[PDB]
Amino acid sequence: LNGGITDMLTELANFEKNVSQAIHKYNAYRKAASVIAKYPHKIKSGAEAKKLPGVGTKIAEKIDEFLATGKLRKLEKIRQDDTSSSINFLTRVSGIGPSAARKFVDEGIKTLEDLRKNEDKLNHHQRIGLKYFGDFEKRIPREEMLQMQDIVLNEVKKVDSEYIATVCGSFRRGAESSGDMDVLLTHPSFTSESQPKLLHQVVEQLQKVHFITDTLSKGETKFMGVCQLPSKNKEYPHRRIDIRLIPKDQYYCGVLYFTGSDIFNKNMRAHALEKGFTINEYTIRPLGGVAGEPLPVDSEKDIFDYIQWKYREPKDRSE
DNA sequence: CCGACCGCGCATCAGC
DNA sequence: GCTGATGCGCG
DNA sequence: GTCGG
Numbered sequence: 466l467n468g469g470i471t472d473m474l475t476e477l478a479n480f481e482k483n484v485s486q487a488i489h490k491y492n493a494y495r496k497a498a499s500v501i502a503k504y505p506h507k508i509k510s511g512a513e514a515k516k517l518p519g520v521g522t523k524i525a526e527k528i529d530e531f532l533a534t535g536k537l538r539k540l541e542k543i544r545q546d547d548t549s550s551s552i553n554f555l556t557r558v559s560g561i562g563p564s565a566a567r568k569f570v571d572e573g574i575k576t577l578e579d580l581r582k583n584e585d586k587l588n589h590h591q592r593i594g595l596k597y598f599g600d601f602e603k604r605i606p607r608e609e610m611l612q613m614q615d616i617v618l619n620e621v622k623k624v625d626s627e628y629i630a631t632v633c634g635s636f637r638r639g640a641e642s643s644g645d646m647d648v649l650l651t652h653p654s655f656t657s658e659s660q661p662k663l664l665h666q667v668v669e670q671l672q673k674v675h676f677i678t679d680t681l682s683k684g685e686t687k688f689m690g691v692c693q694l695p696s697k698n699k700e701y702p703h704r705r706i707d708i709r710l711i712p713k714d715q716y717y718c719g720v721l722y723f724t725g726s727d728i729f730n731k732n733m734r735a736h737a738l739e740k741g742f743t744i745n746e747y748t749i750r751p752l753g754g755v756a757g758e759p760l761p762v763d764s765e766k767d768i769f770d771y772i773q774w775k776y777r778e779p780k781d782r783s784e
Numbered sequence: 785c786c787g788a789c790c791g792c793g794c795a796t797c798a799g800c
Numbered sequence: 801g802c803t804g805a806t807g808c809g810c811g
Numbered sequence: 812g813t814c815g816g
Contacts (some may be wrong), residue, residue: 481812489789493812496789521813562808588796590808634811646811681809682794689794689809707810709793723811730811746790746811788814790811798805 467501467548469510470528473537474498477527483556484549486563488654497524498676506531551575559594559601559681559705560575590681597691600702604642609701612694613646617706620670627653628667629716633723638779645705651716664688664710678703686710715747717762722746729782737772 469521477585478494481487496519501508508514510532520528531759543549548570555566558580570717571618574583580595587595592603614632621628630650636643647725650667655661668688671677679691688708694701711719722730722745730744737744742751749768769776 473813487812489805490812492789493814496813519813523812564807590795592806645810684794687793725811746792786816789812791808792815794811795810796805798803800802800804 466506467504468510469535470514470531471498471502473527473531473540474501474524476543476751480549483553483563483566484543493519493565494524526627547575555580557602558591558598560591561594584604587776593679593681593691597703600602600764601705603702603704605704606646607636607639607641607643609645609694609704610636613692613704614708616674616676616694617646617648617671618661620674620676621650621667624666624670625652629713631720631739633720635725637724638726638782645707648708649716649719649723650708650710651713651719652710653713655710655712656714657712659712664708668708672715677706715760715761717765718744718747718749718768721765721768724779724782726783728784729777732784733772735772738774742771746773 474494475498478491478498481494482491494500497517500517500519501514504514504517508528511527511529514520514528515522515525527537527539536738552563552566552570555561555569555575556563558577561569569579569583569586574580574586577595577598580587584592584595615774617632618630622632628650629652630648631637632646634640634643634645634647636646650664652660652663655663664683664685664687668677668680668683668690671692675695676689677692681689681691683690686709688706688730690706690708691703692706693703709719709723734744737749738752742760743750743752743756750756750759760767760771766776
């Protein structure tokens with residue numbers, strides 16, 4: 466409906482973040498693009514959009530110019546500037562942030578090919594990001610997710626039956642396609658007052674059956690890496706998977722949190738306020754304005770009960 | 785007018 | 801070698 | 812860049 470405007474804003478956001486290294490402007494722009502995309506009328510002026518939360522005076526000028534001229538002068542000058550367009554592109558490589566990008570580009574490294582020539586100048590995460598540059602930008606069709614979940618839940622169940630695993634993200638809301646695979650893991654012998662190699666044991670199994678192919682980073686609670694579905698002798702693209710081990714007594718707060726949507730938790734985090742509780746990523750604690758101890762949570766329903774809110778199916782949690 | 789705008793786990797580096 | 805800072809990715 | 816205290 467307003468495809469141009471939201472593209473323009475998203476270009477602007479990518480540029481403040483990657484090139485100006487001004488992350489707050491980056492979120493301001495995308496915030497603005499977020500609300501404008503969710504606007505059931507074709508915007509007809511800057512002023513019109515100004516009535517929106519997240520759209521201020523400056524973005525309003527840009528919308529008038531884009532509407533009037535079909536382009537934005539600021540963006541043009543930016544696209545025809547090799548430095549900032551080459552820094553902006555390099556960040557598409559996982560492991561290359563604003564700072565690394567600019568660094569490379571200062572010393573001539575501008576392209577994927579320049580990166581291959583210089584593999585010896587990238588860290589491990591970066592090498593892997595370079596390797597799977599195309600694959601990481603692909604979306605994961607649901608029926609692959611489904612198939613991926615099956616192996617992950619299946620291989621966890623096989624290390625120790627007490628393991629609990631939940632693939633969250635938009636996928637848990639039944640979105641047709643995901644961007645990565647986010648699994649939350651926990652285990653009875655693991656609380657806020659508590660085994661030695663719980664995550665490891667599971668990452669290994671998944672490696673042992675050739676499902677996990679590369680590790681970006683791995684510690685006692687968070688795993689970031691790459692996986693791939695087996696094929697029938699045209700191989701599947703490689704995909705990003707995170708795996709997070711969480712204490713059992715905060716597990717379900719976790720699940721609720723990493724299921725979103727961002728907006729659903731917003732209207733919930735800030736509805737539980739009305740009713741006298743503070744929800745966060747870890748716990749639901751009561752308010753006295755001082756927060757008491759965390760309450761027991763045995764499921765997602767429990768959290769919904771505390772704020773006496775009707776339970777909302779992950780699917781219907783779009784907002 | 786002026787500061788907030790999430791803040792955390794892991795990898796790596798800067799400074800001893 | 802150790803400790804704290806920084807970069808990066810991510811709900 | 813936009814917001815709200």
